[PDB]
Structures are given as C-alpha cells and as structure tokens.
Write a protein that binds this ligand. Structure first.
Ligand SMILES: *[C@@H]1O[C@H](CO)[C@@H](O[C@@H]2O[C@H](CO)[C@@H](O[C@@H]3O[C@H](CO)[C@@H](O)[C@H](O[C@H]4O[C@H](CO)[C@@H](O)[C@H](O)[C@@H]4O)[C@@H]3O)[C@H](O)[C@H]2NC(C)=O)[C@H](O)[C@H]1NC(C)=O
Ligand SMILES: *[C@@H]1O[C@H](CO)[C@@H](O[C@@H]2O[C@H](CO)[C@@H](O[C@@H]3O[C@H](CO)[C@@H](O)[C@H](O[C@H]4O[C@H](CO)[C@@H](O)[C@H](O)[C@@H]4O)[C@@H]3O)[C@H](O)[C@H]2NC(C)=O)[C@H](O)[C@H]1NC(C)=O
Ligand SMILES: *[C@@H]1O[C@H](CO)[C@@H](O[C@@H]2O[C@H](CO)[C@@H](O[C@@H]3O[C@H](CO)[C@@H](O)[C@H](O)[C@@H]3O)[C@H](O)[C@H]2NC(C)=O)[C@H](O)[C@H]1NC(C)=O
Ligand SMILES: *[C@@H]1O[C@H](CO)[C@@H](O[C@@H]2O[C@H](CO)[C@@H](O[C@@H]3O[C@H](CO)[C@@H](O)[C@H](O)[C@@H]3O)[C@H](O)[C@H]2NC(C)=O)[C@H](O)[C@H]1NC(C)=O
Ligand SMILES: *[C@@H]1O[C@H](CO)[C@@H](O[C@@H]2O[C@H](CO)[C@@H](O)[C@H](O)[C@H]2NC(C)=O)[C@H](O)[C@H]1NC(C)=O
Ligand SMILES: *[C@@H]1O[C@H](CO)[C@@H](O[C@@H]2O[C@H](CO)[C@@H](O)[C@H](O)[C@H]2NC(C)=O)[C@H](O)[C@H]1NC(C)=O
Ligand SMILES: *[C@@H]1O[C@H](CO)[C@@H](O[C@@H]2O[C@H](CO)[C@@H](O)[C@H](O)[C@H]2NC(C)=O)[C@H](O)[C@H]1NC(C)=O
Ligand SMILES: *[C@@H]1O[C@H](CO)[C@@H](O[C@@H]2O[C@H](CO)[C@@H](O)[C@H](O)[C@H]2NC(C)=O)[C@H](O)[C@H]1NC(C)=O
Ligand SMILES: CO[C@]1(C(=O)O)C[C@H](O)[C@@H](NC(C)=O)[C@H]([C@H](O)[C@H](O)COC(C)=O)O1
Ligand SMILES: *[C@@H]1O[C@H](CO)[C@@H](O)[C@H](O)[C@H]1NC(C)=O
Ligand SMILES: *[C@@H]1O[C@H](CO)[C@@H](O)[C@H](O)[C@H]1NC(C)=O
Ligand SMILES: *[C@@H]1O[C@H](CO)[C@@H](O)[C@H](O)[C@H]1NC(C)=O
Ligand SMILES: *[C@@H]1O[C@H](CO)[C@@H](O)[C@H](O)[C@H]1NC(C)=O
Lengths: 236, 354, 271
C-alpha cells in the first residue's frame, strides 16, 4: 500500500497472513472460523498443497510473528473455471483444522447479500502488508488507506484497459495515482462501510505498476462468486 | 451675444473614426489604441456613435464633462449574441476568463454601440506563438461570425507535440504518431509498460485531451487564465492527431485543423446590425492635456459686443464686408495707432469691421 | 553632452576637426530682411515705430552645421556648439536639394531648444519631413548623443534622438508646409515674459508668425542636431549644409506698409 497510514491495533480484525516456507507471502480474509478467502493464482502449482502453509491471525506486527500460529491449513479449494493466461475467477478457499477462536481483536467480515445498491463512486478501504517503493522489500506492520471505486465502462476505455476487464472484476483507486496497491498484496481485503456494517466486495488479483496514473488496481468481484462459496461451504 | 474665438493648440482626437472602422476585431484579437494630447467632445461622440448603454466603474459620468486626462486607453471587440451576459463586472464566464478581463481596480467606463452590418467584416486571428508555429492557419468559417476562446493553455519554449521515432518504433500496441521536431525541445513523454500478457504496451501523456485529462499533473500544457491586458496563450492541442505514423525523422510536426480544441463561434447580427463593446481606461484625473470641450462656449454665429477675439477683449459692433488683404496667418486688423478695427472668422471665412 | 539617456553606443570617437566659420554676409534690413510681421495684425499704408527683438544691423553670422558618416565626436555636443539662448536668434537656413531618379528631395538641419533636456521639462524641436515642418515642444527623453539621418540615400546609423515608448505630455503640436524648390530659409525665435514666439519664411521676405506658447520657465540653451548621410559629402554630390545664426536684442525699428500690407522698407534707427 502506497500513501497509507499505519493501522492501530483492533482496527481491521480480519487480516489473515499466509506464511509459506517460514515467511509471509500473501494475505487473506476470514469470513467463518473454518474458511479463509484469498487469491487463486498464488495457490497454483506447485504450491497447490494442503501442507506447507501456516496461517497467522491477530498478529498486528511482523515482529511477533514466529514459530507458533493458527492450525494447519486444510485442503485448498480453487475455482475450477480459473485460467492462467487470461485472468478470470481468481478466488481460492483455505480451510483450517482447528476453529478460529474469536479473540478480542478478531471479527470476521460479512459477505455481501445479492443486491446492495452500491454507489458508483463509493469509499472503500484496502489493507495489507505491501510496499511503498519500486517493488519494495517487505512490510513489518499493517498499512491501510482509502480508495474510490471506478466505473466499469470508464475503466475499460482504450486509454486504461482495452477490453481486459471481465464482468467478474472491478476497478478501484485514483486515476491521478499516488494511491494504489503493489506487489505482495495478494488477497488484500477490500471493505466498504454500508449501514454501519462492513462488507467484502473486492479481492486483489492483478495490476500494472504501483501508485502510477492511468493504471488503477483490478479487484475480483465477490458478488458473482458468492454462489460458489456457499456451494463449497454446503458441500464441505 | 458674446463672441469667443480661439485657435486650438492641439489637434482633434478623432475617436469616432477609429470606433467606426469597418474591420471589427474578434474578442480573441481585441485591439488597443492610446489617445493622448488631443481634444474631444464626449456628447458629440456619443451622438455620432449609436450608443445603447454607457456606465463607468469607480468614477462618475458627470465628472467626465470638462475634465483633463493624461491618456485614454481604448479596447474594442465584437459581442457574440449568446455570451452578451459574460461582460458583467465580475463573472466566471468564458469571455472574461479566456479573451479579455475587465479591470475593476481602476476608473473605467464601458460603452455598448452598434454599426450597420452591410459594411462590417470580422478579422479573426490567432495571437498564439506556439500554435502558429506548429501549423495553424485561417479559421475560414463564415462572414459576420466572431470566434471566442473557451479554454486557455500555456507552455514554455520546450514543447513539441511529437514522439521520438526511436521509442515509437518499439511499440507493438498503441503506437503513437512520431515525427521530426525542430532543433531544441523536449519530446512527448512516452514509456513502454508491461501488462499480464502484452509486453509492448506504450503509454504517453496528455490523454485523452487536455480539456478532460484524467491527470493534469502529467501533461505539459497547463490551463491558465488571462490577466489584465494579456491575450489568450493558446488553444488546446490533441497530441493523438499531431504528426504521422512511423516517420524516419524527415517530417515536420504539423497538427491537423481538427486537433485544436477549446474554441467556438457565434454570429453578431441583430436587427441588421452588429454589436460592439468598448472599454475606456482613464489615466490621471484633473491633470493632463487630453481635455473635453463640452463645457466651453460653442463658436456661435456672429450677430452682425462683449467679444474675446484671439486674446483681445472689448465691446463694439460688427458689419459684414469684403477684404482681400487677409493672409493665411492674419486674423486681426489694426489701425495706425494700436486699435482693433476688423477681424476674420476662421470657421466661416467672413470678414467683419469693428 | 546634451541629454542624459544612454540610448545608443555604436561609434563615438574623440577628434577636434570642426570650428564655426564667420560668414561674409552682412545684415541689411532696408528691404525687409531681418524683420517679422506682428503675430496677428494687419496694417494698410502706414508707418509704425515698433520696439521688439530684432537683429543688429551690420552683424556677422556663425555656421553651426555638422555632417558626419558613421562617426560622432564628443566635442560636437559641447561649447561652442551648445550656445546660450539669452534673448533670441535669427537663423538663415540653406535648403539642400537631392535627386533620386530625378526626384527632388528637401532636407536641412533640425534645431532643439530647451533648458536641461530631461523628461521633467519641455524641449522644443523643429524637424522638417520633405516639405512639411513639424514642431513638438514636448517633454522628450533626449539621448545623450542625438543625431538625424537622411531619408533619401540613407546613412549607416538610425535616427535616434529621443527614447519614448509612448507619446509624452506635450503642450503644442502642429504641421506646417514650405516650398520645396527654395534655396534659403529664415527663422525667428525669441522669448519674452515666459512666452515663446516662432517665425519662418520661404523667400527673402519678412517672416510669418507660427505660434505662441506660455511656459513660465526661462529657455537658456539651443543646439543644432548633426545630420548623418552618405550623399551630402564632397565626394559624390559636392553639396554642403549651412545653418547660420546671429544673436537678437531689443531694438526699435521703423516699418513701412503698402496699400496691401506688404512691408516695403525698414529702418534700424541705430545704424
Ligand atoms: C526619464 O529620464 C530618466 C533619465 O535618467 C529615466 O531614468 C532612466 O531609466 C533607464 C531605463 O529604466 C535606466 O536604465 C537602467 O538603469 C538600471 C540601473 O538603475 C540598469 O540596471 C539597466 O540596465 C539594464 O538595461 C541595459 C540596457 O540598457 C542592459 O544592458 C542591462 O543588462 C540591464 O538589463 C538600465 O540601464 C536609467 O538608469 C535611469 N536613469 C536614472 C538616473 O535613474 C526615466 O526612466 C525617464 N522616465 C520615463 C517615464 O521615461
Ligand atoms: C506631421 O507630419 C509628420 C510627417 O509627415 C507626421 O508623422 C507621420 O504620421 C503618420 C500617421 O501617424 C505615420 O504613419 C504611421 O506610421 C507607422 C509606422 O511608424 C504605421 O505603423 C502606421 O500605420 C497605421 O496606419 C495604417 C493605415 O495606413 C494601419 O493599417 C495601421 O494599423 C496603423 O494604424 C502609420 O502608417 C508616419 O510614420 C509619420 N511619419 C514620421 C516621419 O514620423 C505627423 O503625423 C504629422 N502631424 C500631424 C498632426 O498631422
Ligand atoms: C459638444 O457637443 C455638445 C453636444 O452636441 C454640444 O452641446 C449641445 O449644444 C446644443 C446647442 O445649444 C444643445 O441643443 C439644445 O438642446 C436642448 C435639449 O437638450 C434644447 O432644448 C435646445 O433648444 C437646444 O436644441 C445640446 O443640448 C447640447 N448638448 C449637451 C449634451 O448639452 C456642445 O456645444 C459641443 N461643444 C463644442 C465646443 O463643440
Ligand atoms: C518655390 O521656389 C522656387 C525657387 O525660387 C520658385 O521658382 C521660381 O519662380 C519665380 C517666379 O516665376 C521665377 O522667377 C522668374 O523666372 C523666369 C525664368 O524662369 C524669369 O523670366 C522671370 O522674369 C522671373 O524672374 C524663378 O526663376 C523660379 N526659380 C526657379 C529656380 O525655377 C517657385 O515658384 C516657388 N514655389 C511657389 C509655389 O511659389
Ligand atoms: C457601405 O456603405 C456605403 C455607403 O452607405 C455603400 O455604398 C452605396 O452602395 C449602394 C449600392 O451598392 C449605392 O447605390 C450607393 O450609391 C453607395 N453610396 C456611396 C456613398 O458609395 C456600400 O455599398 C456599403 N457596402 C456594401 C458592401 O454594401
Ligand atoms: C477658409 O479659407 C481657407 C484658406 O483657403 C481654406 O483652407 C483651405 O481649404 C482647402 C480645401 O479644404 C485646402 O485644399 C487648402 O489647403 C486650405 N488652405 C489652408 C491654408 O489651410 C478653408 O477650407 C476655408 N474654409 C471654409 C469653410 O471654406
Ligand atoms: C537600425 O535598426 C535596425 C532595425 O531594428 C537594426 O537592425 C536590427 O539589428 C539587430 C542586431 O543585429 C537584429 O537582431 C535585428 O534583426 C535587425 N532588424 C532588422 C529589421 O534587420 C539595426 O541594427 C539598427 N542599426 C544600428 C546602428 O543600431
Ligand atoms: C567637386 O568639385 C571638385 C573641384 O572642382 C571636382 O574635382 C575636380 O574633378 C575633375 C574631374 O575629375 C578634375 O579634372 C579636377 O582636377 C578636380 N579638381 C580638384 C580641385 O580636385 C569634383 O569632381 C567635383 N565632384 C563631382 C562629383 O563632380
Ligand atoms: C568629408 O568628411 C565629412 C564627410 O565624410 O563628409 C566632412 C567633414 O570633413 C566632417 N564634418 C564636420 C562637421 O566636421 C566629417 C568628420 O569631421 C570626419 O569624417 C571625421 O569625423 C569625426 C567624428 O572625426 O567628415
Ligand atoms: C473554406 O471552407 C470551405 C468549406 O469547408 C471550403 O470549401 C474552402 O475551400 C475553404 N477555403 C480555405 C481557403 O480553406
Ligand atoms: C523519410 O525516410 C523514409 C526512409 O528512407 C522514407 O520512406 C520516407 O519517404 C521519407 N519521408 C520524407 C518526407 O522524405
Ligand atoms: C550604454 O548602454 C550600452 C548597452 O546597454 C552599454 O554597453 C554601455 O556601456 C552604456 N554606456 C554608458 C555610459 O552607460
Ligand atoms: C581645435 O583646433 C583648433 C585649431 O587649432 C583650435 O583653435 C581649437 O581651440 C581646438 N579645440 C579644442 C577644444 O582644443
């Protein structure tokens, strides 16, 4: 996250950091104590294995992160309609062995019900352990910032993205730049405030550059995939 | 009854001749002329030039009758029929923001007048150095039509609406036009980016246009407002329509006529007449040589007493006779011993005896 | 140095090669030469005793004509070329004629009259333009080294005697015309009680009134601007510039008028 302020403890109690090879790689979102939502392209082969994945929850800083964290990750479920060359249906589900005990600073996000009347230019927040420079090095604490939602037809113009936005994706950020996501922010939760309730509407999938004009961030639309999440939850 | 004749020392201003000129400039080409060291009659000027309204800012119209000024500055231009309300004292209109702003910090008078449109021709011209440099020409729209600017943009002496042919050649997607730029400038900022699959995505600046640009901080030409006494810096230029594709550095960078944006035109014909605006700038009150003669006694007819003839005062009678001894420089006839006996009127060429 | 504005520095040398010559012509007021008509007055067949500013009978003239080619000397802008305007001067001017493709052109030297020649005072300038005569008497920012150029067969320098972007505050302005085929021209200039008077004539006749101007300040210095040309030299045309000046004083004259107002004879009364 470029141009963002540090988040105080107990602000976004849903940032789940996935640790592979004893180091954090991608983030995630917790909706139920038995499932975590993140991107599917990072869980691709050969990383598509139930083991070799450690989930750390409630860690407000990378200093406290060490040996000893949440239970082992169960079998990871990805969207079968996903592709590699063409970005589409980038959603993955990871289950935990032990249930996620709701601590003081722990609260799952609410899934958006079909039908919400989203404002074309609505305020939303992005949070994750990213960078603030040329591909950066790493992040030691939480970093969050607010962004706006970009309309689909305007984002799909010939000067932004020439027919590269599927109906299952949304654009967020500022067209002027200086505020956007960067590398390493895979699975960054995109939350919005509606009727004093926070909802998850986006999932960081891909982009171009970091905090540069004419290149906004691309987020996966969870509204279309809400049916697949419920189907997987009912099957499991 | 009284007769007062005097030879003027300063010529007439002839303001009506310049105001009634048949070459009416557009608001984009507002002309300025400085009148100084001359005499004028204000009411005669307002009568000869058909005036619709006359008001003064920070100054009283009654005080103009009989005052002297150092110099008077006049600015005139035609009024479009659609934007006549933008000439109000203080307004965020296109006229006062792009063509000519009225100064509200000094004593100025505004005049609205008309002229028969059977003889009126509008002279449209672009007072932009950088726009004329890259291939601008005459408007060629219609007669009795005036052009007013809507957005004003300014650049430095480094702008060139052209991309580098070397950088534009290595672009397999969204190739911008490129051509040869004159000696000493800065080429258009274009950089190649990499996307998910395409590794030849070339992006440039000032997109899509400077009027509706997404990021003004990344475009060279910046929007500016006209000051007090300055013209429009120039119209907007669409960089996507300038130059040609794949030029081997052997072609100039001339934009098409459709590449210039930010200007509109409208007619000025109303009741077989054209409407013209004029602004008077007064410099120096109660001091100067540009005075008004509306408080002086007019040169009335000579009733053939109480006369003031070329600096000589007295009382007597007059009788119209013929006289051939008067030369070009002679006006008064004196007797053998210092007494005036005859004179000549320099407005009717009639000789009288006293 | 006459002015104070550094308006041009092209070629300013320092050489002493000019001295005013004393003319062999003697003032003779018997037939009218040296006398002027009153400002606006007509007299028919009378004899008048008039006390005014007239030149003295039996006086010599001094030439103040300066001609150069792309060079200006500093000594030209000092004494005795910058004379004192005590009461007035009577000047006889020679009309120099030039032919360009058998077309006659007339030009002679211009004279400037002032006190300090700065833009806080009024300075009187008389300059001819091929048949028309212009008088300014304005507040001009005079160059420190002024000069005049010839329009026909132009010189190397440019006409630069004042630097004013806009027209300054002037008290008088008018144009007069003269005969182009004449060979001698006469002038009268003098001041009395803060008023300035000017006279001129095309032929060997009494001069004609020009104008009157009330200033209130005493004019003390007059100067003749040098003329730069490439044809008036003694190498191609064998022509010369001549501008003689004699001092004026308050004397008494006896004027004779005919039945039509023409001056016939004049007596100096002190010769
Ligand atoms: C009335 O007359 C006075 C005469 O003194 C006149 O004042 C002069 O004005 C000029 C023009 O502004 C002054 O000249 C300038 O002087 C400054 C120093 O004060 C210099 O730095 C300037 O140099 C610039 O211009 C040069 C070319 O001329 C360049 O080579 C140089 O690099 C600089 O860019 C310039 O010489 C002059 O100093 C004054 N004189 C005095 C005594 O103040 C006044 O302006 C006149 N009034 C009107 C209304 O015209
Ligand atoms: C007394 O006589 C002198 C000399 O004869 C005279 O000076 C002349 O005045 C005229 C009128 O102002 C000058 O002519 C102007 O010259 C300038 C260049 O210096 C031109 O730019 C002017 O162009 C105007 O007129 C054009 C139409 O002809 C327009 O299209 C244009 O837009 C301008 O409005 C104009 O031609 C002339 O240069 C001077 N000459 C000299 C030697 O100074 C003076 O005016 C006379 N005095 C009186 C009271 O008549
Ligand atoms: C300068 O121009 C003005 C305007 O033309 C001259 O003043 C005008 O003089 C005439 C003649 O006296 C006035 O006419 C009179 O009008 C009244 C009605 O207003 C009428 O009742 C009378 O019978 C007479 O016709 C005219 O009003 C007057 N204009 C103004 C504005 O007062 C003036 O003489 C000119 N000055 C010079 C020096 O030329
Ligand atoms: C402008 O000045 C010239 C030069 O003085 C005037 O021309 C001169 O005119 C007079 C009058 O005609 C000429 O005098 C006559 O000359 C003829 C010979 O041509 C002689 O036979 C007569 O007896 C008489 O003397 C004079 O020669 C002539 N000078 C020249 C050089 O041609 C001219 O008239 C003046 N302009 C005006 C409008 O007066
Ligand atoms: C500009 O105005 C003048 C004078 O009002 C017009 O000249 C007149 O033209 C008509 C018809 O052409 C003639 O019958 C008159 O005799 C003309 N009068 C004079 C004084 O010349 C002129 O036509 C007008 N300009 C245009 C383009 O119509
Ligand atoms: C009064 O007489 C003078 C003297 O002739 C006239 O002035 C002349 O006018 C004609 C025509 O305009 C010009 O060609 C001459 O050049 C003028 N001469 C001078 C010396 O100025 C004047 O026009 C006459 N006024 C009237 C009303 O008839
Ligand atoms: C006389 O005036 C002319 C016209 O301004 C001068 O010519 C200019 O000279 C400068 C200096 O080299 C050039 O930059 C201009 O382009 C010239 N202008 C034109 C129209 O040619 C000339 O130098 C002046 N002469 C003097 C002696 O000062
Ligand atoms: C100006 O006058 C001089 C003096 O008369 C002329 O010089 C004479 O020229 C002729 C022909 O070349 C010679 O035969 C004489 O010997 C020269 N005299 C002297 C004293 O040098 C000169 O030619 C005249 N200028 C012109 C342009 O004709
Ligand atoms: C023939 O020389 C002229 C000329 O070229 O027509 C004539 C004359 O010798 C001279 N003029 C004056 C008034 O002194 C004038 C100059 O005196 C000289 O040329 C030298 O100039 C200076 C300033 O030293 O030169
Ligand atoms: C002016 O425009 C008209 C109509 O578009 C065209 O016929 C004419 O050739 C143009 N003239 C010039 C000089 O551009
Ligand atoms: C520029 O050079 C290229 C390559 O030699 C050539 O094809 C093209 O016609 C040239 N253009 C001009 C205007 O000379
Ligand atoms: C006059 O000005 C010129 C150019 O600005 C300069 O070269 C010269 O030294 C100046 N002379 C004086 C005496 O100021
Ligand atoms: C110039 O030279 C003449 C001739 O000798 C001489 O009379 C005069 O005094 C000189 N002028 C100066 C200023 O030295």
């Amino acid at each position: 996250i470029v141009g963002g302020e540090s988040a105080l403890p107990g602000a976004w109690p849903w940032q789940v950091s996935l640790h592979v090879q004893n180091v954090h790689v991608c983030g995630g979102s917790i909706i139920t104590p038995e499932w975590i939502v993140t991107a599917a392209h990072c869980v691709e082969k050969p990383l598509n294995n139930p083991w070799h994945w450690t989930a750390f929850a409630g860690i407000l800083r990378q200093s406290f992160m060490f040996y000893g964290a949440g239970y082992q990750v169960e079998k990871v479920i990805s969207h079968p309609n996903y592709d590699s060359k063409t970005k589409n249906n980038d959603i993955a589900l990871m289950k935990l062995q032990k249930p996620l005990t709701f601590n003081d600073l722990v609260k799952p996000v609410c899934l958006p019900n079909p039908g919400m009347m989203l404002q074309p230019e609505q305020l939303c927040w992005i949070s994750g352990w990213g960078a603030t420079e040329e591909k950066g090095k790493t992040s030691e604490v939480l970093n969050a910032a607010k962004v706006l939602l970009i309309e689909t037809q305007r984002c799909n113009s010939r000067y932004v993205y020439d027919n590269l936005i599927t109906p299952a994706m949304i654009c967020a950020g500022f067209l002027q730049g200086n505020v956007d996501s960067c590398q390493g922010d895979s699975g960054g939760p995109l939350v919005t405030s509606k009727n004093n309730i926070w909802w998850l509407i986006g999932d960081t999938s891909w982009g171009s550059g970091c905090a540069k004009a004419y290149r906004p961030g691309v987020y996966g639309n969870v509204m279309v995939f809400t049916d697949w999440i419920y189907r997987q939850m009912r099957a499991d | 009854a009284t007769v007062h004749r005097r030879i003027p020392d300063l010529p007439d201003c002839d303001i009506d001749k310049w105001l009634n000129n048949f070459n009416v400039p557009s608001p984009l080409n507002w002309e300025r002329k400085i009148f100084s060291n001359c005499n004028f009659n204000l009411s005669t000027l307002l009568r000869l030039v058909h005036t619709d309204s006359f008001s003064c800012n920070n100054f009283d119209e009654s005080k103009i009758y009989g005052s002297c000024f150092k110099s008077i500055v006049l600015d005139k231009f035609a009024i479009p029929n659609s934007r006549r309300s933008d000439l109000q004292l203080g307004s965020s209109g296109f006229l006062q923001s792009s063509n000519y702003k009225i100064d509200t910090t000094s004593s100025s008078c505004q005049l609205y007048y008309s002229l028969p449109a059977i003889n009126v021709t509008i002279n449209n011209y672009n007072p932009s150095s950088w726009n004329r440099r890259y291939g601008f020409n005459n408007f060629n729209l219609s007669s009795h039509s005036v052009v007013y600017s809507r957005y004003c943009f300014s650049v430095n002496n480094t702008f060139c609406p052209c991309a580098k042919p070397s950088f534009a050649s290595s672009c397999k997607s969204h190739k911008p036009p490129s051509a040869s730029c004159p000696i000493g400038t800065n080429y258009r900022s274009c950089e190649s980016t990499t996307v998910l699959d395409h590794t030849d995505w070339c992006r440039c600046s000032c997109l899509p246009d400077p009027i509706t640009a997404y990021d003004p901080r990344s475009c060279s030409q910046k929007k500016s407002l006209v000051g007090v006494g300055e013209h429009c810096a120039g119209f907007g230029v669409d960089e996507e329509k300038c130059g040609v594709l794949d030029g081997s550095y052997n072609v100039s960078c001339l934009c098409s006529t459709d590449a210039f944006l930010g200007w509109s035109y409208d007619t000025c014909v109303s009741n077989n007449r054209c409407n013209i605006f004029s602004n008077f700038i007064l410099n120096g009150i109660n001091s100067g040589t540009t005075c008004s003669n509306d408080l002086l006694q007019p040169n009335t007819e000579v009733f053939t007493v109480d006369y003031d003839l070329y600096g000589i005062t007295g009382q007597g009678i007059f009788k119209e006779v013929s006289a051939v001894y008067y030369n070009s420089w002679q006006n008064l006839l004196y007797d053998s011993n210092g007494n005036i006996i005859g004179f000549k009127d320099f407005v009717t060429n009639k000789t009288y005896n006293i």
